[PDB]
Design a protein around this ligand. Structure first.
Ligand SMILES: *[C@@H]1O[C@H](CO)[C@@H](O)[C@H](O)[C@H]1NC(C)=O
Ligand SMILES: *[C@@H]1O[C@H](CO)[C@@H](O)[C@H](O)[C@H]1NC(C)=O
Ligand SMILES: *[C@@H]1O[C@H](CO)[C@@H](O)[C@H](O)[C@H]1NC(C)=O
Ligand SMILES: *[C@@H]1O[C@H](CO)[C@@H](O)[C@H](O)[C@H]1NC(C)=O
Ligand SMILES: *[C@@H]1O[C@H](CO)[C@@H](O)[C@H](O)[C@H]1NC(C)=O
Ligand SMILES: *[C@@H]1O[C@H](CO)[C@@H](O)[C@H](O)[C@H]1NC(C)=O
Ligand SMILES: *[C@@H]1O[C@H](CO)[C@@H](O)[C@H](O)[C@H]1NC(C)=O
Ligand SMILES: *[C@@H]1O[C@H](CO)[C@@H](O)[C@H](O)[C@H]1NC(C)=O
Ligand SMILES: *[C@@H]1O[C@H](CO)[C@@H](O)[C@H](O)[C@H]1NC(C)=O
Ligand SMILES: *[C@@H]1O[C@H](CO)[C@@H](O)[C@H](O)[C@H]1NC(C)=O
Ligand SMILES: *[C@@H]1O[C@H](CO)[C@@H](O)[C@H](O)[C@H]1NC(C)=O
Ligand SMILES: *[C@@H]1O[C@H](CO)[C@@H](O)[C@H](O)[C@H]1NC(C)=O
Ligand SMILES: *[C@@H]1O[C@H](CO)[C@@H](O)[C@H](O)[C@H]1NC(C)=O
Ligand SMILES: *[C@@H]1O[C@H](CO)[C@@H](O)[C@H](O)[C@H]1NC(C)=O
Ligand SMILES: *[C@@H]1O[C@H](CO)[C@@H](O)[C@H](O)[C@H]1NC(C)=O
Lengths: 99, 167, 420, 198
């Protein structure tokens, strides 16, 4: 009370100092069962990409994607992320990604 | 979907295509387990408000703590409508309201000098002997001069922005 | 169509014509007055951030806005408490009604509490309460004076009124029969006490009929308490808007702080957190400003209600159209959710009659002016009656006073005064 | 503690001024809260944005302060109107409004100057030492009703007297302070008595 009132004397009355809040004990990482690692050797390590006006769009779903092995490979010049961060992406589940 | 809360069971019936869920205020209160098909219920963590009922520091340093919107189980003990007051005792008497707690409960520092919690009294219990042939005519009087203070004005201040914002 | 301002009446004005009423009617009205609102306490930090230390560290860079809003809300709560504390708690001793309830013929069954139901409000107050019917940082604080305490205050006020009149508001309550109390109420508006002492039965019947009509109207319709319902709806809409303002992006990527923290790194998410904080703070400041304006309006209404209580329930106000349309007689407060209801018992006139009047009369060369009343005629004879009730009395020397000769008064009849 | 409202107004004004002064210590997201330090350490490009953010923050704070000051000024205007009404109705006259100037029958008031306020000394008339009596609506002497003009018919147990309403002063029931209206079988509560004729 003396800290929230910024003084050393307190008169008779009721003062709302702070609030109560239970702290969490542990954390869960509940995720579904997924296999069939998404093939990145055909999207990146392909024979030859198409032209700019005829870019190839390939839908990929029902897989598990590891985005850390791409940035840490030190083989990509630019790895700019928009809307998301270069990290904190291996802990999220996407609905439908494109390439 | 991340966050914190008490994952308890529920009674609502999620449709086969429905996975997540919301409430009246568009707040997620129930989701589905990714592994199994059990319908959970995201109950928010326990939290509320804390109020410190204390007398003047010149009198004593004994204080009390009131937890607002709790059920005496989320934290000598008193279950009130405003909350659960831990630090005072519930007496059966009734005095004037010194420290308004809420819902009629009032706290005061009385003697064994401790903090008590009682119900405020609305005044004395008087009963006029009303009858069809009874009147009470006064036989004396007493002139009483009372005081009444009302503010008329305040300090005339003036804040120049061209000197406050940009010095 | 075009709204009509009212009926088209043409008063037959004349310098020798007067309309004195020959009857009356007791008409009890109803007035709704808000006294207080719901005491809310919006947690600034929990509303802006919601259990986020990274967001709190950025919110701390905006100054003492959190403390300012908390102090404003606390002041609003204390003000809403003191409003009802000054409106209802205007009596020191809690009076009670005697067991033998025979108030000269008046029936206060639905007004006074009854032991048939549990310890709660009376029948009319229960009807009023029945007709007016833990969050993301927005908690609700309970009022200090509970509904039972407000009901006990209203019952004590009713008992003190019925048993004393206005003597309980200036010191110690003085016992007095309700018949003599009504006689004093009538004498306070000019009407003599013999009218009441002769038509007490009719007046009690009219009062009971008015109370029954009020009860039937309150049981039939529910929009009678419009102001309280409007205040409740405004508060609920303000709270709902303040809650829904958390679903807006305010230019950020999303409105979910935890999702933003899980997706973007802190360096890039700092700007999004700042934008969300600015938006939520602007919304909360707008809410606090509107709440302060509404609290000032409610304080004005509560001051008006306390004035109308002190000057009309603890006494008899002589102000026109202040505590009832008509000649005010008495009033009874009734409890209401976040408000107060008054039963303004007024003295309304009835069918009048045309007579012939004169400013004075001259008997022996001197002008005789009416001391208390007015000179009226029925075509052949002249009588001095009251101003609000037709009671023809013989014009004697004890009812009029002589002041000068009858040569300067513009208009005077040559009547014949009677010397007892 | 008598001038509690005045002390509270002064404290609220002082707290508002102190908060308005202290709001200059926050940067509102800027690098620093010192405008001169920012201008001396940064180039004009970034200094423009820093000054814009500081101006936005300080303008929001000043607008909040002005809004609160307007609310308090409206409250003070209402209080001053009430005080002027009480002055005009109790110091320049005798108010008949119940509980308007003192708790009791208002007699007179005396104004007293106070810092940013006014103090009234409401002189009231509070009755005391009340005694129980037996009252009656009217009396009948010769078959005609008798109602008192101004007073109440009270009896000490054996004799009926007419006294004032706010002060016990018994007087013999005469025809001067009593009028006749009606009969003795239309009033509920008639009491047979003898009216004296001077
Ligand atoms: C999913 O995987 C877990 C181990 O990761 C395994 O125990 C479980 O049987 C699998 N199937 C289901 C339906 O959970
Ligand atoms: C693709 O080629 C890179 C070489 O830059 C190699 O590191 C990587 O393992 C290969 N496969 C995939 C799936 O990226
Ligand atoms: C479904 O609705 C019925 C009534 O419409 C209700 O009785 C039942 O409890 C509900 N079931 C739920 C909410 O699971
Ligand atoms: C919670 O508070 C209520 C209110 O009195 C009480 O009746 C109840 O026993 C408490 N505990 C639980 C588990 O409900
Ligand atoms: C009336 O009360 C006063 C005290 O206020 C006292 O001095 C006086 O004697 C009393 N008069 C009677 C008649 O009792
Ligand atoms: C007579 O009284 C009636 C109302 O009872 C009124 O409408 C009418 O104008 C009066 N006439 C005269 C001549 O006073
Ligand atoms: C006066 O009006 C009432 C109705 O409120 C009626 O009962 C009564 O008979 C009337 N009196 C006269 C004298 O007409
Ligand atoms: C008063 O009215 C109620 C209902 O309106 C009735 O039950 C009661 O008997 C009445 N009182 C008397 C004394 O008749
Ligand atoms: C007027 O009243 C008197 C007495 O009340 C009566 O004698 C007289 O006949 C009345 N005149 C008319 C025109 O009604
Ligand atoms: C009253 O009005 C009538 C009608 O106009 C007129 O003849 C008479 O002189 C007036 N009397 C007075 C005293 O004005
Ligand atoms: C009243 O009498 C006087 C004196 O005789 C006379 O002048 C006057 O006209 C009379 N008034 C009326 C209305 O007849
Ligand atoms: C009047 O009667 C009441 C109750 O009957 C009693 O309390 C009071 O003392 C009496 N007063 C006098 C002066 O006898
Ligand atoms: C009432 O007053 C009269 C007049 O003074 C007196 O004669 C009589 O004895 C008194 N009675 C009582 C009971 O005091
Ligand atoms: C006055 O009340 C008493 C007590 O109930 C009763 O006996 C008496 O008849 C009543 N008198 C009148 C006129 O109502
Ligand atoms: C008053 O006198 C009349 C005369 O007949 C009588 O009928 C009546 O009962 C008397 N009053 C009382 C209260 O005795």
């Amino acid at each position: 009370t003396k800290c929230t009132l910024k003084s050393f004397t307190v008169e008779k009355g009721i003062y709302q100092t702070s609030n109560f809040r239970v702290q969490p004990t542990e954390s869960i990482v509940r995720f579904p069962n997924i296999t069939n690692l998404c093939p990145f050797g055909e999207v990146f390590n392909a024979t030859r990409f198409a032209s700019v006006y005829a870019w190839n769009r390939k839908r990929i779903s029902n897989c598990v994607a590891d985005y850390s092995v791409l940035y840490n490979s030190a083989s990509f010049s630019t790895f700019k992320c928009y809307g998301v961060s270069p990290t904190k992406l291996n802990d999220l589940c996407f609905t439908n990604v494109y390439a | 979907l991340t966050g914190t809360g008490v994952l308890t069971e529920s009674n609502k019936k999620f449709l086969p295509f429905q996975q997540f869920g919301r409430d009246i205020a568009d707040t997620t209160d129930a989701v589905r387990d990714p592994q199994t098909l059990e319908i959970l219920d995201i109950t928010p963590c326990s939290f509320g408000g804390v109020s410190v009922i204390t007398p003047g520091t010149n009198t004593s340093n004994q204080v009390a703590v009131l937890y607002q919107g709790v059920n005496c189980t989320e934290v000598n003990v008193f279950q009130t409508r405003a909350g659960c007051l831990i630090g005072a005792e519930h007496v059966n008497n009734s005095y004037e309201c010194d420290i308004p707690i809420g819902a009629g409960i009032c706290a005061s520092y009385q003697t064994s000098q401790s903090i008590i919690a009682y119900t405020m009294s609305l005044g004395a219990e008087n009963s006029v002997a009303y009858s069809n042939n009874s009147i009470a005519i006064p036989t004396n009087f007493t002139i009483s001069v009372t005081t009444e203070i009302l503010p008329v004005s305040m300090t005339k201040t003036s804040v120049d922005c061209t000197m406050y914002i940009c010095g | 169509y075009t709204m009509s301002l009212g009926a088209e009446n043409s008063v037959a004005y004349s310098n020798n014509s007067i309309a004195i009423p020959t009857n009356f009617t007791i008409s009890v009205t109803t007035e709704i007055l808000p006294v207080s609102m719901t005491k809310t306490s919006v947690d600034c930090t929990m509303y802006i951030c919601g259990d986020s230390t990274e967001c709190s560290n950025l919110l701390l860079q905006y100054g003492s806005f959190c403390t300012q809003l908390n102090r404003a809300l606390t002041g609003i709560a204390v003000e809403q408490d003191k409003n009802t504390q000054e409106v209802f708690a205007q009596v020191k001793q809690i009076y009670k009604t005697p067991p033998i309830k025979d108030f000269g013929g008046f029936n206060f069954s639905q007004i006074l509490p009854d032991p048939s139901k549990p310890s709660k409000r009376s029948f009319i107050e229960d009807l009023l309460f029945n007709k007016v019917t833990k969050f993301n940082g927005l908690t609700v604080l309970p009022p200090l004076l509970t509904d039972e305490m407000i009901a006990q205050y209203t019952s004590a006020l009713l008992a003190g009124t019925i048993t004393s009149g206005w003597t309980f508001g200036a010191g110690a309550a003085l016992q007095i029969p309700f018949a003599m109390q009504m006689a004093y109420r009538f004498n306070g508006i000019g009407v003599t006490q013999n009218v009441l002492y002769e038509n007490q039965k009719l007046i009690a019947n009219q009062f009971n009929s008015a109370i029954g009509k009020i009860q039937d109207s309150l049981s039939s319709t529910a929009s009678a308490l419009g102001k309280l319902q409007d205040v409740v709806n405004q508060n609920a809409q303000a709270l709902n808007t303040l809650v829904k303002q958390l679903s807006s992006n305010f230019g950020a990527i999303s409105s979910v702080l935890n999702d933003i923290l899980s997706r973007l790194d802190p360096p890039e998410a700092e700007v999004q957190i700042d934008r969300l904080i600015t938006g939520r703070l602007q919304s909360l400041q707008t809410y606090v400003t509107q709440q302060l304006i509404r609290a000032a309006e409610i304080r004005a209404s509560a001051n008006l209600a306390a004035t109308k209580m002190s000057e009309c329930v603890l006494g008899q106000s002589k102000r026109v159209d202040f505590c009832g349309k008509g000649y005010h007689l008495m009033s009874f407060p009734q409890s209401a959710p976040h408000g107060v209801v008054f039963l303004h018992v007024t003295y309304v006139p009835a069918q009048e009659k045309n007579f012939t009047t004169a400013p004075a009369i001259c008997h022996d060369g001197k002008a005789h002016f009416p001391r208390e009343g007015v000179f009226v005629s029925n075509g052949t004879h002249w009588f001095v009656t009251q101003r609000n009730f037709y009671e023809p009395q013989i014009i004697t020397t004890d009812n009029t006073f002589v002041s000068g000769n009858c040569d300067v008064v513009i208009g005077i009849v040559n009547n014949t005064v009677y010397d007892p």
